């Protein structure tokens, strides 16, 4: 929208940009005695009146052109007042600032959904240069050609007459609030024009037809202090008079949204499995290698020289991805916990096409609920009409704040909440000694109903199983008989334990509260949940610990499951717990493999899933098609 005023005392020269509506005001300086006007336009100019017309402010005149002029003042417009004459010389230019607003792959607001518009920006968090240890966005230069594949392309197209920019100028700018989270390189090679230091640049454009290319990169993920929207503006200013300051004549803008960080659940196909090689960790590693080979995925083993005697691969990092209509790449989120494996996600994970991100106090005080074994994500779900095609994030907390309670760090909580594509859900997991939601819940695939099954630990189921075993004449079977150097317990003495029964009742109450939370928050039914037998015992600080290896704390690779070996009672040559788990899971098409981790992980209060990390294939669904 531009207003042009014509006076009969002197003609005026105005500049119009193709595609913009130009309103022509004629009553501002019309003769007082005049009452009607007529318009004589060159054939290259289209006039719309909204053959004389009354001279009143109600009527409006709008001007349009179809071709950019080749000379200044090419097209004239004559206003005849009733007869005085007024002239308007006018030249047309085309100024376009094009991005991938259609989210299709090929080149002033951002809207969600499949019928929206707006471009997507990728954080340059990977390391495409092999002669550096920092991320690609920590410097204001592009050192590789491949580094241009993580940057969004923006094209400035100018069709202007010859010798047009001797009196006009073009400025590319961004707001000072968003200037520290974006960088723009002009392709000539790549020289920085906009960034955390320069919020404006004076573009140099030649007359005629010209196309310029800019590569845009982001330097920060969306957070509580960053909604995620960046607006880049182009301004055409008049510089006809040297003494007079430049006056803005045209302005166009392009809006980008920074792609959020997205998790992947256990139902996605696996691609790579990580593990640690600590002392005496040989049979576990052999089982993991066999399972990975069966599941057709590679393995990455960290040598003990880099473990620093740390075997908890799951807690240190969490792998997700970031995608955009032109490029998708995984990202590793580094936990604020720094124990032994503090250098692995920064030295042996982040690299070419593998980004890195971290939050929280690196050297400050944190709790045990900040470990990323407490962070999980559910399969896509429909909750009372609302759709979550990427799932929902689940992490543990307490019932109410108090002096002894623990919580995940607020920085991590606001980070996960700022990633809006998956709304986080708080679960009650502080009752556990470690406080990890992976110790009592899991997700497995299934080819029926919603497409998945939620497995929850259930002391009741184990007690019922032992009751049936004792009823069938097997009451002297020895739990922990497969393992040695430990006390084996008969079924009757484990059934007649009042303290154990009370501890398991309290644990069952907590797990039932968690299940009631999960059903409401994920829209599940009683047919979507499977109860895995388990036994807990209260310990120091009256917090629960697994009585025997946690069978729900297992590794899931497609249809292959690596389950911790419970070493339960042996009936008819087979372990009753293993037989029950096989009967519960195999009808879903899954194959159950039991891995021994007693003296290596269970003694250290960990299981197969606690010591492994898996990279999963990104969702086929495009996050920008989600409507949060």
């Amino acid at each position: 929208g531009t207003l042009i005023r014509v006076t009969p005392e002197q003609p005026t020269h105005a500049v119009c940009v193709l595609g913009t509506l130009t309103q022509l005001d004629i009553c501002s300086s019309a003769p007082d005695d005049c009452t009607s006007f007529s318009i004589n336009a060159s054939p290259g100019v289209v006039v719309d009146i909204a053959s004389t017309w009354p001279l009143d402010p109600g009527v409006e005149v709008t001007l349009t052109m179809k071709a950019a002029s080749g000379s200044t003042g090419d097209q004239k417009v004559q206003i005849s007042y009733y007869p005085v004459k007024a002239l308007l010389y006018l030249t047309a230019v085309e100024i376009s600032l094009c991005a991938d607003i259609t989210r299709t792959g090929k080149v002033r607001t951002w809207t969600w959904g499949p019928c929206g518009q707006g471009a997507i920006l990728l954080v340059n968090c990977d390391r495409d240069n092999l002669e550096s240890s920092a991320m690609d966005c920590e410097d204001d230069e592009v050192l590789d050609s491949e580094d241009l594949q993580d940057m969004s392309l923006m094209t400035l197209s100018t069709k202007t007459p010859k010798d047009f920019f001797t009196n006009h100028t073009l400025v590319l700018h961004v707001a000072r609030s968003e200037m520290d989270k974006v960088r723009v390189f002009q392709a000539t090679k790549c020289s920085v024009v906009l960034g955390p230091k320069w919020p404006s640049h004076y573009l140099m454009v030649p007359g005629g037809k010209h196309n310029m290319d800019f590569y845009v990169e982001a330097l920060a993920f969306p957070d509580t202090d960053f909604p995620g929207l960046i607006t880049l503006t182009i301004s055409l200013l008049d510089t006809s008079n040297l003494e007079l300051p430049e006056a803005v004549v045209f302005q166009d803008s392009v809006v980008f949204r920074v792609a959020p960080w997205i998790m992947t659940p256990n139902t996605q196909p696996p691609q790579e499995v990580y593990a640690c090689s600590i002392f005496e960790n040989e049979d576990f590693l052999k089982s993991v290698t066999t399972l990975a080979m069966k599941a057709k995925c590679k393995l990455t083993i960290c040598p003990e020289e880099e473990n620093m005697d740390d075997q908890w691969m799951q807690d240190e990092m969490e792998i997700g991805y970031i995608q955009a209509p032109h490029k998708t790449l995984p990202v590793v989120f580094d936990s604020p916990r720094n124990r032994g494996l503090k250098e692995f996600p920064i030295k042996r994970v982040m690299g070419p096409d593998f980004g890195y991100v971290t939050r929280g106090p690196q050297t400050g005080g944190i709790s045990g609920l900040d470990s990323f074994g407490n962070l999980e994500v559910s399969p896509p779900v429909t909750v009372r009409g609302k759709e979550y095609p990427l799932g929902r994030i689940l992490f543990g907390d307490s019932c109410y704040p108090s002096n002894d309670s623990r919580q995940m760090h607020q920085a991590l909580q606001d980070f996960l909440s700022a990633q809006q594509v998956q709304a986080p859900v708080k679960l009650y997991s502080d009752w556990l000694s470690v406080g990890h939601v992976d110790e009592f819940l899991s997700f497995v695939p299934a080819p029926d109903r919603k497409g998945f099954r939620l497995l929850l630990a259930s002391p009741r189921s184990c007690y019922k199983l032992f009751q049936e075993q004792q009823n069938e004449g097997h009451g002297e079977a020895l739990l922990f008989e497969g393992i040695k150097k430990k006390k084996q317990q008969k079924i009757k003495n484990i059934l007649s334990n009042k303290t154990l029964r009370e501890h398991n009742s309290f644990v069952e109450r907590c797990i039932d509260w968690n299940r009631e939370l999960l059903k409401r928050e994920l829209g599940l039914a009683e047919s979507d949940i499977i109860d895995i037998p388990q036994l807990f015992k209260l310990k120091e600080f009256s917090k629960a610990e697994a009585f025997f290896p946690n069978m729900v704390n297992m590794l899931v690779l497609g249809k292959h499951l690596g389950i911790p070996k419970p070493f339960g009672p042996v009936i008819n040559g087979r372990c009753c717990l293993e037989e029950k788990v096989c009967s519960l899971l195999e009808p879903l098409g899954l194959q159950c493999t039991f891995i021994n981790d007693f003296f290596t992980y269970h003694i250290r209060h960990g299981e197969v899933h606690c010591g492994t990390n898996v990279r999963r294939k990104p969702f086929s669904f495009k996050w920008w098609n989600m409507v949060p």
């Binding site: 005697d309 740390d310 075997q311 908890w312 807690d315 916990r337 124990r339 944190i366 709790s367 045990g368 900040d370 470990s371 000694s433 470690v434 120091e540 250290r604 209060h605 960990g606 606690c610």
Partner: peptide, 13 residues
């Protein structure tokens, strides 16, 4: 904690 799963613990760590 040092070699235990617990981030901090009066007994195991």
């Amino acid at each position: 904690x040092y070699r235990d799963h617990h981030y901090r613990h009066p007994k195991y760590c």
